[PDB]
């Protein structure tokens, strides 16, 4: 009852002779599916927030294990991947982060594409297509590296009125400027306006 688990589950936990190839009585280690079923039975009686906490912890542990296994087993030619940040740079997706952060598929794609563009442009990834890298978009990457700036420069054409400033204009004549200083008093009386 204290563990919120069934008595036969308690008996199975006690019966575990964790001897692991002798030095004691015998190796009573359960099989793989028996281990899985026992874990299910002993965990089935928890709360909800604890369930999400366990899910996040297991997700992080399996993420680290999978990253290590990939690093130690699968290495495509031309890439000397040896670290979690190496896998991050290669796959354009962060593998060492927590479960608290939430994002969308398209936002993750934005992050990955932007990271790949930066990698190609900064000449750190070898065999980059320098011929392709000299297009208009990469020249304007200063305003193309962020969604906000790209959205603003895109909307500037279709809705220029939002960016129209009624108080000043590019190419405004100095005589209109001095008119502006002569009209920018504290309170503008009518006679001052016509003056």
């Amino acid at each position: 009852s204290a563990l919120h688990t069934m008595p036969s589950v308690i008996r199975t936990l006690v019966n575990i002779r964790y001897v692991t190839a002798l030095n004691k009585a015998e190796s009573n280690l359960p099989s793989w599916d028996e281990w899985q079923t026992l874990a299910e039975n002993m965990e089935a009686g928890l709360s909800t927030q604890q369930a999400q906490t366990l899910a996040d912890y297991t997700a992080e542990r399996l993420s680290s294990v999978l990253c290590n296994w990939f690093l130690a087993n699968i290495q495509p030619e031309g890439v000397s991947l040896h670290s979690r940040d190496d896998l991050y740079s290669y796959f354009l997706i962060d593998n060492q982060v927590s479960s608290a952060i939430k994002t969308t598929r398209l936002a993750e794609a934005i992050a990955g594409i932007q990271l790949y563009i930066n990698r190609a442009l900064n000449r750190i990834e070898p065999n980059a297509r320098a011929d392709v890298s000299t297009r208009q978009f990469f020249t304007d990457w200063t305003v193309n590296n962020r969604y906000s700036t790209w959205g603003g420069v895109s909307r500037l054409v279709y809705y220029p009125e939002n960016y129209i400033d009624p108080t000043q204009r590019i190419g405004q004549t100095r005589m209109m400027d001095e008119l502006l200083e002569n009209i920018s008093q504290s309170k503008l009386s009518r006679d001052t306006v016509e003056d």
């Binding site: 990271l115 930066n118 900064n122 750190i124 969604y147």
Partner: peptide, 18 residues
């Protein structure tokens, strides 16, 4: 902001790269 944090992540990754 979330987008601001993503942009900061991009900047910091670029700083590490250089």
């Amino acid at each position: 902001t979330r987008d601001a944090l993503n942009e900061a992540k991009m900047w910091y990754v670029r700083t590490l790269e250089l």
